[PDB]
Amino acid sequence: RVSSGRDLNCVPEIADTLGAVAKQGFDFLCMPVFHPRFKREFIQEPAKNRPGPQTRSDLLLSGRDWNTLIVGKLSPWIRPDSKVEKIRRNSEAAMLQELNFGAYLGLPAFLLPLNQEDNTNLARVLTNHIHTGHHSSMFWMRVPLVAPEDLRDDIIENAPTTHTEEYSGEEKTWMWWHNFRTLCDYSKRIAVALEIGADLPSNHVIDRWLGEPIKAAILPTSIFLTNKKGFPVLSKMHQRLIFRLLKLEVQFIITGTNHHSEKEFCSYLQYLEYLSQNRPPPNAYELFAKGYEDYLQSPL
Amino acid sequence: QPLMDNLESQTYEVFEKDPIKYSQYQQAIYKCLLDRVPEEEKDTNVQVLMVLGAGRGPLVNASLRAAKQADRRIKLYAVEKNPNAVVTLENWQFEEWGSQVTVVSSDMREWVAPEKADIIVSELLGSFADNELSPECLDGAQHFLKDDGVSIPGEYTSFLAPISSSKLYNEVRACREKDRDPEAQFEMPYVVRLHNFHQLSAPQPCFTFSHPNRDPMIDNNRYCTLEFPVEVNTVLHGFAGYFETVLYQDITLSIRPETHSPGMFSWFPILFPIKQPITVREGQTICVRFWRCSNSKKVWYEWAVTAPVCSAIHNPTGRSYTIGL
Amino acid sequence: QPLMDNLESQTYEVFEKDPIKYSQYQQAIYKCLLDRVPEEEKDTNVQVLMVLGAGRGPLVNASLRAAKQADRRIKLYAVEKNPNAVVTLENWQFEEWGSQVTVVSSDMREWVAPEKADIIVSELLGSFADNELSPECLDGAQHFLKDDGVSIPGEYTSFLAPISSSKLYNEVRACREKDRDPEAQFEMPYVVRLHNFHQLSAPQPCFTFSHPNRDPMIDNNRYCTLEFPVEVNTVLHGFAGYFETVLYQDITLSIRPETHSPGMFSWFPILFPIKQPITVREGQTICVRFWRCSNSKKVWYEWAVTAPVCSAIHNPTGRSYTIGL
Amino acid sequence: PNAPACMERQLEAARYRSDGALLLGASSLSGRCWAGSLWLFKDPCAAPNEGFCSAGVQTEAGVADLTWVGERGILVASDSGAVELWELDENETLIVSKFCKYEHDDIVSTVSVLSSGTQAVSGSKDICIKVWDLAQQVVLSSYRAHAAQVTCVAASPHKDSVFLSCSEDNRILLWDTRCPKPASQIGGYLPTSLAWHPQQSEVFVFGDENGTVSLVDTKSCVLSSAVHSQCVTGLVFSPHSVPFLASLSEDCSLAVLDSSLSELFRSQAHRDFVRDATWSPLNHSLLTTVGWDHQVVHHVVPT
Numbered sequence A: 001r002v003s004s005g006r007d008l009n010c011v012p013e014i015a016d017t018l019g020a021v022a023k024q025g026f027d028f029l030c031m032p033v034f035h036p037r038f039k040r041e042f043i044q045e046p047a048k049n050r051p052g053p054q055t056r057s058d059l060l061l062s063g064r065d066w067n068t069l070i071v072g073k074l075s076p077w078i079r080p081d082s083k084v085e086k087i088r089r090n091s092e093a094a095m096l097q098e099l100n101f102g103a104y105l106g107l108p109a110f111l112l113p114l115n116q117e118d119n120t121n122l123a124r125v126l127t128n129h130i131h132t133g134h135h136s137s138m139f140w141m142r143v144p145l146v147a148p149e150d151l152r153d154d155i156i157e158n159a160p161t162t163h164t165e166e167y168s169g170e171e172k173t174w175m176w177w178h179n180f181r182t183l184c185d186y187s188k189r190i191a192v193a194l195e196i197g198a199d200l201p202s203n204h205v206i207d208r209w210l211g212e213p214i215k216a217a218i219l220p221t222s223i224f225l226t227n228k229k230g231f232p233v234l235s236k237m238h239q240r241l242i243f244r245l246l247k248l249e250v251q252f253i254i255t256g257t258n259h260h261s262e263k264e265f266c267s268y269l270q271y272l273e274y275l276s277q278n279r280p281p282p283n284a285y286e287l288f289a290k291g292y293e294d295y296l297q298s299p300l
Numbered sequence B, C: 001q002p003l004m005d006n007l008e009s010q011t012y013e014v015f016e017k018d019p020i021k022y023s024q025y026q027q028a029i030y031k032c033l034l035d036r037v038p039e040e041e042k043d044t045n046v047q048v049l050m051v052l053g054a055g056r057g058p059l060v061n062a063s064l065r066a067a068k069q070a071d072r073r074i075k076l077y078a079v080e081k082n083p084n085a086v087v088t089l090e091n092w093q094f095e096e097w098g099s100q101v102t103v104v105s106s107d108m109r110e111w112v113a114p115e116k117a118d119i120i121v122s123e124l125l126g127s128f129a130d131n132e133l134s135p136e137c138l139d140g141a142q143h144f145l146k147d148d149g150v151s152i153p154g155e156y157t158s159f160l161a162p163i164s165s166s167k168l169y170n171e172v173r174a175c176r177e178k179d180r181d182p183e184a185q186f187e188m189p190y191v192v193r194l195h196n197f198h199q200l201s202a203p204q205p206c207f208t209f210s211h212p213n214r215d216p217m218i219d220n221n222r223y224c225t226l227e228f229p230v231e232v233n234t235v236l237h238g239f240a241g242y243f244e245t246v247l248y249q250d251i252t253l254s255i256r257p258e259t260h261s262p263g264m265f266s267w268f269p270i271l272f273p274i275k276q277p278i279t280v281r282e283g284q285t286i287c288v289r290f291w292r293c294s295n296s297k298k299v300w301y302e303w304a305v306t307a308p309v310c311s312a313i314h315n316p317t318g319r320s321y322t323i324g325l
Numbered sequence D: 001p002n003a004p005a006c007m008e009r010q011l012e013a014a015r016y017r018s019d020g021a022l023l024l025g026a027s028s029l030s031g032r033c034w035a036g037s038l039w040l041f042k043d044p045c046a047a048p049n050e051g052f053c054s055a056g057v058q059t060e061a062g063v064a065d066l067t068w069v070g071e072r073g074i075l076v077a078s079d080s081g082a083v084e085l086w087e088l089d090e091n092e093t094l095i096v097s098k099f100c101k102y103e104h105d106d107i108v109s110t111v112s113v114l115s116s117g118t119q120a121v122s123g124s125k126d127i128c129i130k131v132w133d134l135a136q137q138v139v140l141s142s143y144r145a146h147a148a149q150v151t152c153v154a155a156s157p158h159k160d161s162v163f164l165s166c167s168e169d170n171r172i173l174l175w176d177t178r179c180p181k182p183a184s185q186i187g188g189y190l191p192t193s194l195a196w197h198p199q200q201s202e203v204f205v206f207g208d209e210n211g212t213v214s215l216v217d218t219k220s221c222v223l224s225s226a227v228h229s230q231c232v233t234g235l236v237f238s239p240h241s242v243p244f245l246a247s248l249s250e251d252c253s254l255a256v257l258d259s260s261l262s263e264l265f266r267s268q269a270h271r272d273f274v275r276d277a278t279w280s281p282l283n284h285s286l287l288t289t290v291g292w293d294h295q296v297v298h299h300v301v302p303t
């Protein structure tokens, strides 16, 4: 019933990792296409002339597996909106390189972060790749409900967290998404991979995402509570958000390490399945309208 | 268009599924190596082989198999401009090939070769032979081939045949897209597995290219007039395009129906449509004119029917279709 | 686009009707000749001057006048890629100039110069400075300028200013043509004598180029962020573009309104429109982003407004507008 | 030597211990397998030749950083999100895993042993900083003070509760775990490397993403120099009573600076990114660098 994927930033052996992930019950794997730490130079010698393969071979998986089981991830060092001109230029060339390799592989989707206010150059480079060749692939913008700066622990003595309500301020990540997609001119290939935190924001922040193209919901293992038996569960408020996302038929993505160490890993996924099974059955209207959701027709 | 565009992993995978094509290339390299190195020079003479447009490595493997069966020594360079395929090549080079193969991530027209080649091996052919711009690519690579050097392929020829198909005419007609000339779909070729059609006259040769090119300043532009005898009453809707290539001597590849290479199936004919269907009576001749044109940026074809009636010149100045350089 | 296109006789005639522009070039060459040749070397030191993009000969004449008033010896080359203008130049060379001027019918980027130059003189500037591709042209010509050589112009800078004009917005809107994107007219600059408009903030510098370029591999691509303070309630419809150039030292040319060169009138501002008008309140800042992009075939601009609201990126990948190389 | 047949191309870390033996950390950042390895060379001049090591071991994932834990322990920052502790056998012929605790939710980028040698600090791309108890193999405290990736964590030389951290959120934080709010923000371009002064208790140096090296005193203005053309990857003080400062960069160079940050030595021996530098405890004028070009270079520094 529920389509779920595993998010990893460490894949030592692609065949072994995929197998372990599929055994756990996941339907796909979000993974780096180039080593996440392998920073590359395109302009200055001697590093621009680095030999050897720039990444692992496409021959490691079948075309069907690349097409259906792998979601690409942009390298974390790629910063197209850096204040440093050199980083900006190397990042543009690296972003185009990684996107072009994903298109080479025929990946169904590719993850890009929205983790700051200004993503103008990231949008420019993405728009340019979209208007270059094969137009099938989806771009999932990884954007959090709550920005990391607004959920940091209040542990900096000379920099306290703001305890005042900032109505529009708490909706800042929606503006990050809005500006990005406005810049890319509402491309149908650009969707949201909404990242959920340990504590949910106010309802107005959550409702801000209504009508948005959400294709995936990212659930870090760290947001899961523990029940009397020691198994991962979610708060009532989190469950309420999962149910809303299930109606949008989003793909769920499990990120982070096993925090329920003495309770196995597929337990997180088993809980999502439990929530999916234990939902209100669709009414006469919902069962009837299945297939027509947001399908435009001419009035008779 | 493997020059202007970087082919996808699965595209290279479909090319590689042809066992006959590469066993033909291997036979051509094998014969060439024997003709260039006498038995007595077997252990001293190292032939410099360059695979120009190496893709994911099948011609590199074909060259190595050829050198083993010829019992000759080879030094290989695998030149590829697609950096994605270069990843496959560099992983093959580390894991299997070793020092015998030098992978070059470059356009063959820009590469400053460190040595001259004895043999240049390439597979830059389209369904209409020169439509992937093999002449331009090998012309720019020519300067690093030795004075007595061999190019595999040595030659290729395109062929045209008039066809009738109201089914395909309608198929082209339905390719009208927004924001472009409403008749652009008729001024461009299509790769198509022609099925419901009538070939109206025997295929005739259109354009020929030879490598290495020893006619200073080359001039890859061409103008050809073809006269097709038609023995039936019919309606002309376009021209089917095919090709033949001489890899080395008697070793050839062909998609021309009458001389089609055994089991070479990934290769479909090309179709040049005409905007307006032309009535042809039994005993009349179809006269077609084809031009191969270019500038420093693009290459294109222009075509016109001049008998039994004139058509407009199709694709003037590459307005609807161009092949990027 | 004097690079991609051959300008017409009357276009060159309009350029030549500017007496101030060439008296500025003459003053720049005159000062440069004096700084390069001391009085004692007057009769032994022959300076090699190259007019790069000579048109119908005004900079050749300006160079000769400059050498006479400086009382210095010059050896001139007049390089021009337009063969039609080359006819005017060769008729001038036979009838008047003589052996002192060597007319070269070539693209400056391909010319195999027989000698290196002391000074390269050019007038390859558009209304937005680099929009006629002066950086690319002079970059390719750079290798034949001596190590201590001077380029006139030495530098140029483009400027942008936000404008309000519902009149011009409607004018751009009416440029919708058949068989192209219905909104392409908003994704391209126009040379226009701006009249019924409101400049919303002071022009700010956008892109700068310096010749000769001593930053290996050059990289003429650029990305600029501009923040314009707006003190009025208004509607943003586009950006006016202007430029300034340093011919030599203090000798300059400018179309920037505040520093406009005396009596230089053939030069109108450029206008970058935006697809959707943007409401701006007093005290808000207009933030615009401009990119100079290229490939080996074309150069183009892309632009976006990010404050007070975002616009779409205009002209992505040069889909509506490109400048041919 | 009962070790892996080949070490990975990308050398990430190099550290001399008291006797002058050299510990190397490496990862394969390309090709089929993306793992790592740990090596001990009692003869550092033979490095990186596998057949001439004293001990070598394969790790499951890449080595982003490492550090000695006394004379026989090795603490590793892994790609897996785990902080690992390895230990040399009594014969020093084998490197055995003591603990592999997966506590971070992304790559562990930086690791640093505190004054006591009983605790350590780890920084990650998961934005958290963790304080570990090395004997009980547990995280004592987990801090989410930063708002982006933790670039570098550096333990105070002599105060067991004090450490520095820096991040892509443009913060340099001075920590003192004895405080209710343990972090304090120290007052452009992103900070990328940190090094405490080995003699001056409240003094440290920091490198940034734009090639600048800066001298800072906890009290207060800062002394700085544009040393590199690219990111400052590492900063290592020499063992001398008046220390020298080695700086290394993605610009593939090594610079050795004085007290006033003026250049005294420069090396362009590396053909790829310079990743670590370690000063010999035996000969104080010898500085060893490792890079992604698979070179172990032994520099003679002019003193």
Ligand SMILES: Nc1ncnc2c1ccn2[C@@H]1O[C@H]([C@H](O)c2ccccc2)[C@@H](O)[C@H]1O
Pocket: B002, B003, B006, B007, B011, B012, B015, B052, B053, B054, B055, B056, B079, B080, B081, B082, B085, B106, B107, B108, B109, B123, B124, B137
């Ligand atoms: N001017 C150039 N310099 C360097 N490489 C060049 C060119 C032009 C083309 N190619 C390469 O030729 C291959 C060939 O088309 C091919 C296609 C399909 C399967 C196998 C090989 C492609 O891999 C293509 O990228």
Ligand SMILES: Nc1ncnc2c1ccn2[C@@H]1O[C@H]([C@H](O)c2ccccc2)[C@@H](O)[C@H]1O
Pocket: C002, C003, C006, C007, C011, C012, C015, C052, C053, C054, C055, C056, C079, C080, C081, C082, C085, C106, C107, C108, C109, C123, C124, C137
């Ligand atoms: N790469 C090139 N090599 C050789 N000539 C080149 C180029 C590029 C441009 N030009 C020439 O510069 C002139 C200039 O634009 C001009 C315009 C209007 C009046 C007077 C001069 C034009 O005459 C144009 O043809």
